């Protein structure tokens, strides 16, 4: 489950990081990157608690 | 760790409420204080669970 969680939008436009970095300007792509980062930290806090 | 998690920006401009409140009007400071609130709440939740 922890591995499979790496393929979810979490609200951004795409799960793949490279697509976001190569499709949008930096100052606007930062918010999508931050959405992905928040999702994946919240996915690592679980699997440590459990 | 709990105390040291108070000098992090969490995405805002500065990790000091008394600094943010002295540089931004109320319309444009609640998009910063909110990031601080989210970060500090998550820190407290982790501490309490452990």
């Amino acid at each position: 489950t922890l591995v499979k969680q790496l393929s979810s939008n979490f609200g951004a436009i795409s799960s793949v990081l490279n697509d976001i970095l190569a499709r949008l300007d930096p100052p606007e792509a930062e918010v999508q990157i931050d959405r992905l980062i928040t999702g994946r930290l919240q996915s690592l806090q679980t699997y440590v608690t459990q | 760790t709990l105390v040291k998690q108070l000098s992090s920006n969490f995405g805002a401009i500065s990790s000091v409420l008394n600094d943010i409140l002295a540089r931004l009007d109320p319309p444009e400071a609640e998009v910063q204080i909110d990031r601080l609130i989210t970060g500090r709440l998550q820190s407290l939740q982790t501490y309490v669970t452990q």
Binding site: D25, P26, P27 | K4, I13, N18, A22, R23, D25
Partner: protein
């Protein structure tokens, strides 16, 4: 909680006033591809008198509220000036791209300060067109935050090496404006002054007009030391500060000492007493008495 009683503010006694008029309405500015930097320091500024009155087309302050620009201290306020195309007055903003945005003047993504512009279609709208104002069009790569370039070399496009022939695929890197006094708003010249300043660099001296107040000790008070705002109890201590040091910290990076700018004396900061409140009750069936116990 223990509520504060009075408030004190201490700013250094500085008399000279920052020269702003010498920058804003000067005889002639420079081109957009070569902009000068006027460094302002060691004076008492006043941004409100520049905020109200007069006539400025745009007054956009990024990362700071223009209203509150007269109580917080700063560190070596910078000033930049140049003449810009009418439609590009909005192109100088953090992040957004453009021709002159990445070829003439690139602001950082975290820029703090105020962008000031006003109409300049009276003295800079020459009848034949001012040909002195010049902008760049071609460059190998984009600029970096706060970068300037003056060098002019023949641009190269693909094959047919140029090496200074200004022929096929070779262009002169920079082209002029031309300012006829009958153009539309999209062509009319505009004048821009960019104010930028760093906050956490050093305990500098440029500050807004704020009258000082007498020092008080051993009382939970609100203080304001050179833009450092907080509540605490100011005492007199014996910690040895080296002559160059100003502030002081502790194990967990909290200001527990400070030097007042005027008297130049060491003062400590101790938070006012806190604590929770617990009440002991024998149950509301036998009696209605209680006993409060401040914990800390």
């Amino acid at each position: 909680r223990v509520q504060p009683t009075e408030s004190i503010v201490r700013f250094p006694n500085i008399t000279n006033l920052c020269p702003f008029g010498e920058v804003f309405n000067a005889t002639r500015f420079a081109s957009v591809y070569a902009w000068n930097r006027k460094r302002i320091s060691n004076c008492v500024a006043d941004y409100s008198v520049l905020y109200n009155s007069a006539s400025f087309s745009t007054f956009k302050c990024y990362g700071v509220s223009p209203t509150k620009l007269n109580d917080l201290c700063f560190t070596n306020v910078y000033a930049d000036s140049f003449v810009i195309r009418g439609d590009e007055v909005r192109q100088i903003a953090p992040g957004q791209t453009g021709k002159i945005a990445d070829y003439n003047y690139k602001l950082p993504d975290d820029f703090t300060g105020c962008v000031i512009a006003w109409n300049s279609n009276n003295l800079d709208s020459k009848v034949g067109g001012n040909y002195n104002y010049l902008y760049r069009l071609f460059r190998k790569s984009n600029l970096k935050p706060f970068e300037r370039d003056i060098s002019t070399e023949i641009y190269q496009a693909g094959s047919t090496p140029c090496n200074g022939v200004e022929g096929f695929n070779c262009y002169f890197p920079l082209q002029s404006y031309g300012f006829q006094p009958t153009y539309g708003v999209g062509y009319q010249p505009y004048r821009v002054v960019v104010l930028s300043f760093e906050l956490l660099h050093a305990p500098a001296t440029v500050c807004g007009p704020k009258k000082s107040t007498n020092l008080v000790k051993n009382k939970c008070v609100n203080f304001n030391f050179n833009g450092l705002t907080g509540t605490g109890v100011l005492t007199e201590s014996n910690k040895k500060f080296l002559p160059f040091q100003q502030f002081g910290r502790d194990i967990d990076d909290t200001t527990d000492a400070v030097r007042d700018p005027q008297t130049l004396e060491i003062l400590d900061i101790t938070p006012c007493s806190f604590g929770g409140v617990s009440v002991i009750t024998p149950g509301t069936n036998t009696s209605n008495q209680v006993a409060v116990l401040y914990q800390g």
